[PDB]
RNA sequence: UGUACAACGGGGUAUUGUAAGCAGUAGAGUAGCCUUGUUGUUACGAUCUGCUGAGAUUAAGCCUUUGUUGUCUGAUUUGU
RNA sequence: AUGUUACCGCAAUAGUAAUUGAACUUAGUACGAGAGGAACAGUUCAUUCGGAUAAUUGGUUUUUGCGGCUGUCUGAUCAGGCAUUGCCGCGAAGCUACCAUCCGCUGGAUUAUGGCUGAACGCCUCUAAGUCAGAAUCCAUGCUAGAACGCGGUGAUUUCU
RNA sequence: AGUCAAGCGUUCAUAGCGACAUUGCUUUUUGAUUCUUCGAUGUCGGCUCUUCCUAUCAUACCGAAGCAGAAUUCGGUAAGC
RNA sequence: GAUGAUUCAUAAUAACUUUUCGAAUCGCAUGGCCUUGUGCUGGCGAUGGUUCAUUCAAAUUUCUGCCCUAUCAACUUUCGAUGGUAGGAUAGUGGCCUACCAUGGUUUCAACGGGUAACGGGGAAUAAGGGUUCGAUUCCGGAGAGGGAGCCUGAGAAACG
RNA sequence: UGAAACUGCGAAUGGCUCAUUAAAUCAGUUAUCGUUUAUUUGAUAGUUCCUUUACUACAUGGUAUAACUGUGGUAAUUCU
């Protein structure tokens, strides 16, 4: 067995109890009882009918289901290596960042290097 | 059914071919983004907690988030949206999908881990895949490393050594 | 003169579809007020929303009662 | 009316009921040159008829139960009256429907007919004496009523009247 | 519905038919008659509903065939249905 | 200042804007001033960008011209037909659409309706001249993607590879 | 040097057919003082910090996301 769901009222339909209807477009409806069935043939709207589950959930009655939506308070949390970076040495270079004299000496090296570069280039142009 | 579980920090992922139908009735009537019990699916995941990322049902039509029903439906999808890539700007298209509630129609359910329990997992936590690419932007390097405003980011770059013959180079 | 019976009451089960009463910075709009608001205030106004799956009916041939109030010797006939 | 009264029974007699088809399988087998084309057993269903029943579905609705609607009357509201049960939707309970469901028995003697042994008629023959199997038949099992002049078992049998 | 059997049926009267002749049955036909009924028996059909007969259409069991099978024809007990 | 002619170009007051555009783009060569430095300047280009003009377009639009039919003589206006006013919509005028108002507009000088083996034209066949017939078909303009309807992207589609 | 992918353009041109359509298309001829116009072509943004003094990097600022890695799902799809 199964316990299906009325099209109109939205009520559990235990086996045998109730009717089934098959419209020309092959849509299969179920009705627990002739109340729901007769109303359907009258072409009523369940959102307008008061005792139906559809009205209940559209007018927000018995709303103890929902509370709120959760949110995670953090970051991706993965400072992993790039397969060519040696994560150990990566943290090592982060610690090597203070006393930044290396890049300063590289700049001082490259400054005199750029000097001699322009010098020899100007010499060749003459 | 199957559980495609993933650990995003380690970047690891593995499929698990699940049976024990009552130990998956717990998964029934659950939406996307919802969190169910590690012990209920498996004592190997006792204490663990996941987050339902998504999944494929039968006939391969994926689960879309947000539709909030279990039966399959036909939506007029568009760009910047899951389950359809447009082959032209402006091209909308009607495609069939499955929705954001879990039921017997599903075949594979995709999960992601948010907390690591007391015991250990074979294929997720003991391994870790690297970052396929390094940061191509100056400030991305600067804040990822924490250096300064002036410490010559050009030489703090990542260098990935590979050999053509015996000549090796970082490209 | 009793796990007695009955009449009311309670509970359940059902039927119907959200009672009257109050309130609303809800309401097509329309008249009048002025310190012309920023809910301005007042009069009228179907209908809507909240209390309210509320209210009503429920054995008359439904079920069940730790409740209440009562009732329980009138007539006639019968012999191997 | 059988002494009174009550309970449990017997069973004379009378009535009687179940009926037919399809499909699958047997089997494209038997049979037939081929064409075509069966049957018994088994299973699942149906036709016609009967006897009940209302869980479900449908109908019925004076539950005048709940709601709504018109006209009018009770100053207005609330709540109601009247409209030959005012009208509409729902409507339990009850009744009811091949419009719903369930159920519808097996033993003996027989006809026709085929036989067994067997003479008359030294053979032969179902028959003459005897005897076997055999039908929707007949009679019992079962079902209905129970002679109001058919019967049985058991209980209690009146007082200071 | 019988008796007889010249013939039909490829051959053969009878599997099935059966001319010419002849013997019966029934009263569901229609005549013939005028017994009862003219001081009145309500007069056709249909509807409804029961029961009876068998001269059996079907169904049960059988017999015969010019019945290989299928289909059919003749006949028996049978009016239960 | 121009115009055939403007409430034109254009300028300035007073505000509106959720605020448009006013280069965080790219390639070569790398050069000069010295206050001797990653100091300041500097070239040839590509991309994109607000406005205007231009160009390739596009859309509406003035005048004239189309086959056979009166065995089609009245057509249009319900529910836009003709105009006016106002507004919406448009990229823009405009019944294009809406509200109100006036009752107009077309017609024998062939309206309107029917048929068409009708896409139109530049042209093609045939001839002294006049002309008759054909023209789907290489070029120009239309329409369509099986019939209809709708819409996204875009400067440009009511798109059908 | 260099596939794939993001981006930017183009895919509205071309090509095919002649079903519709008889003041409609179309041909010549006017207007846009009644409008849109990518692209080309020529010109064209000293004025954008809004208690505009610490309110803020301008030798320059923030975010993915594809391609890819691997887990994959349908019988099939230029499917995801």
Swiss-Prot record, chain A:
Location of region: Disordered: 66-126
Superkingdom of the source species: Eukaryota
Cellular location(s): Cytoplasm
GO biological process: cytoplasmic translation; translational elongation; translational initiation
Biased amino acid composition, Basic and acidic residues: 89-126
Role of this protein: Component of the ribosome, a large ribonucleoprotein complex responsible for the synthesis of proteins in the cell. The small ribosomal subunit (SSU) binds messenger RNAs (mRNAs) and translates the encoded message by selecting cognate aminoacyl-transfer RNA (tRNA) molecules. The large subunit (LSU) contains the ribosomal catalytic site termed the peptidyl transferase center (PTC), which catalyzes the formation of peptide bonds, thereby polymerizing the amino acids delivered by tRNAs into a polypeptide chain.
Subunit structure: Component of the large ribosomal subunit (LSU). Mature yeast ribosomes consist of a small (40S) and a large (60S) subunit. The 40S small subunit contains 1 molecule of ribosomal RNA (18S rRNA) and 33 different proteins (encoded by 57 genes). The large 60S subunit contains 3 rRNA molecules (25S, 5.8S and 5S rRNA) and 46 different proteins (encoded by 81 genes).
The name this protein goes by in its record: Large ribosomal subunit protein eL24A
Lineage of producing organism: Eukaryota, Fungi, Dikarya, Ascomycota, Saccharomycotina
Gene that this polypeptide is encoded by: RPL24A
UniProtKB/Swiss-Prot annotation, chain B:
Its biological purpose: Component of the ribosome, a large ribonucleoprotein complex responsible for the synthesis of proteins in the cell. The small ribosomal subunit (SSU) binds messenger RNAs (mRNAs) and translates the encoded message by selecting cognate aminoacyl-transfer RNA (tRNA) molecules. The large subunit (LSU) contains the ribosomal catalytic site termed the peptidyl transferase center (PTC), which catalyzes the formation of peptide bonds, thereby polymerizing the amino acids delivered by tRNAs into a polypeptide chain.
GO cellular component: 90S preribosome; cytosol; cytosolic small ribosomal subunit; nucleolus; nucleoplasm; small-subunit processome
Entry's transmembrane regions: none
Extra information: Present with 66000 molecules/cell in log phase SD medium.
Any GO molecular function: structural constituent of ribosome
Subcellular location: Cytoplasm; Nucleus, Nucleolus
Crosslink feature (Glycyl lysine isopeptide (Lys-Gly) (interchain with G-Cter in ubiquitin)) location: 116, 131, 149
Protein name (database record): Small ribosomal subunit protein eS6A
Gene Ontology terms describing biological process: maturation of SSU-rRNA from tricistronic rRNA transcript (SSU-rRNA, 5.8S rRNA, LSU-rRNA); translation
Highest taxon, organism lineage: Eukaryota
Species the sequence originates in: Saccharomyces cerevisiae (strain ATCC 204508 / S288c)
Record's keyword terms, sorted: Cytoplasm, Isopeptide bond, Nucleus, Phosphoprotein, Ribonucleoprotein, Ribosomal protein, Ribosome biogenesis, rRNA processing, Ubl conjugation
Entry annotated with the keyword Protein biosynthesis: no
Keyword Phosphoprotein assigned: yes
Residue window of the full protein shown: 1 to 171 of 236
Residues with Phosphothreonine modification: 163
Subunit structure: Component of the small ribosomal subunit (SSU). Mature yeast ribosomes consist of a small (40S) and a large (60S) subunit. The 40S small subunit contains 1 molecule of ribosomal RNA (18S rRNA) and 33 different proteins (encoded by 57 genes). The large 60S subunit contains 3 rRNA molecules (25S, 5.8S and 5S rRNA) and 46 different proteins (encoded by 81 genes). Interacts with snoRNA U3. uS11 interacts with MPP10. Component of the ribosomal small subunit (SSU) processome composed of at least 40 protein subunits and snoRNA U3.
Family: Belongs to the eukaryotic ribosomal protein eS6 family.
């Amino acid at each position: 067995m199964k316990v299906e769901i009325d099209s109109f009222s939205g009520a559990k339909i235990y086996p045998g109890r109730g009717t089934l209807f098959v419209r020309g477009d092959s849509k299969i409806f179920r009705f627990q009882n002739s109340k729901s069935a007769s109303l359907f043939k009258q072409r009523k709207n369940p959102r307008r009918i008061a005792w139906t589950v559809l009205f209940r959930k559209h007018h927000k009655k018995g709303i103890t289901e929902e509370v709120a939506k959760k949110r995670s308070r953090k970051t991706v949390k993965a400072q992993r290596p790039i397969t060519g970076a040696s994560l150990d040495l990566i943290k090592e270079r982060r610690s090597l960042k203070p006393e930044v004299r290396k890049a300063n000496r590289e700049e001082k090296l490259k400054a005199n290097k750029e000097k001699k570069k322009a010098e020899k280039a100007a010499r060749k142009a003459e | 059914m199957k559980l495609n579980i993933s650990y995003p920090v380690n970047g690891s992922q593995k499929t698990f071919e699940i049976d024990d139908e009552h130990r998956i009735r717990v998964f029934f009537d659950k939406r996307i983004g919802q969190e169910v019990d590690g012990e209920a699916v498996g004592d190997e995941f006792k204490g663990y907690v996941f987050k339902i990322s998504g999944g494929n049902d039968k006939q391969g039509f994926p689960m879309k988030q947000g539709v909030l029903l279990p039966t399959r439906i036909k939506l007029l999808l568009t760009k910047n949206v899951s389950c359809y890539r447009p082959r032209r700007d402006g091209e909308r298209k009607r495609k069939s999908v499955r929705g954001a509630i879990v039921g017997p129609d599903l075949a594979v359910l995709a999960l992601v881990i948010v907390k690591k329990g007391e015991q250990e997992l074979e294929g997720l936590t003991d391994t870790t895949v690297p970052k396929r690419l390094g940061p191509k932007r100056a400030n991305n390097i600067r804040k990822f490393f924490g250096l300064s405003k002036e410490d010559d980011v050009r030489d703090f770059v990542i260098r990935r050594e590979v050999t053509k013959g015996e000549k090796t180079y970082t490209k």
